[PDB]
């Protein structure tokens, strides 16, 4: 588990997968591990920064309606950045 940083090996199972083929019936075992993806990374690199990005687009609701250049600059930069992040 220490050499597996990105996931968490939650469960394992030991089963049989014997099958009937055209050349005959072959005996077969199957072990299965269950990998849960670590969330801390996606919290910090995806969710947090997107909220921080959406929240910025709101601070333009507090600029006077006369200074539209400021509003567009915010709304557009946050939208563009949003794209990049997703890419």
Partner 1 sequence: GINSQLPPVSYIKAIDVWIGACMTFIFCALLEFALVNHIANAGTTEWNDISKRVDLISRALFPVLFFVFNILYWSRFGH
Ligand X SMILES: CC[C@H](C)[C@H]1O[C@]2(CC[C@@H]1C)C[C@@H]1C[C@@H](C/C=C(\C)[C@@H](O[C@H]3C[C@H](OC)[C@@H](O[C@H]4C[C@H](OC)[C@@H](O)[C@H](C)O4)[C@H](C)O3)[C@@H](C)/C=C/C=C3\CO[C@@H]4[C@H](O)C(C)=C[C@@H](C(=O)O1)[C@]34O)O2
Q: Which residues bind ligand NAG (CB under 6 A)?
A: 10-13, 32-34
Q: Is 69 in the site for partner 1 (CB under 8 A)?
A: no
| Per-residue mark of binding to ligand X, 66-85 (x: CB under 6 A) | --------------------
Among ligand X, ligand NAG, partner 1, none, what does residue 86 contact (CB within 5–8 Å per kind)? none
Ordered DSSP codes for the chain: -TT--SEEEEEEEEEE--EE-SS-EE--EEEEEEEEEPSHHHIIIIIHHHHHHHHHTTTTTTS-TT-HHHHHHHHHHHHHHHHHHH-
For 12, the token pair is: 């394992």
**Among residues 70 and 76, whose Cβ is nearest to partner 1?**
70
Among ligand NAG, ligand X, partner 1, none, what does residue 12 contact (CB within 5–8 Å per kind)? ligand NAG
């Amino acid at each position: 588990s220490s050499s597996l940083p990105s996931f968490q090996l939650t469960n394992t199972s030991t089963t049989y997968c014997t099958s009937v083929t055209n050349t005959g019936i072959y005996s077969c075992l199957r072990t299965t591990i269950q990998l849960k993806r670590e969330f801390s990374f996606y919290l910090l690199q995806l969710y947090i920064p997107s909220c921080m990005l959406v929240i910025v687009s709101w601070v333009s609701f507090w600029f006077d309606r006369t200074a539209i250049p400021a509003r567009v600059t915010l709304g557009v930069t946050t939208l563009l950045t949003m794209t990049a992040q997703s890419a």
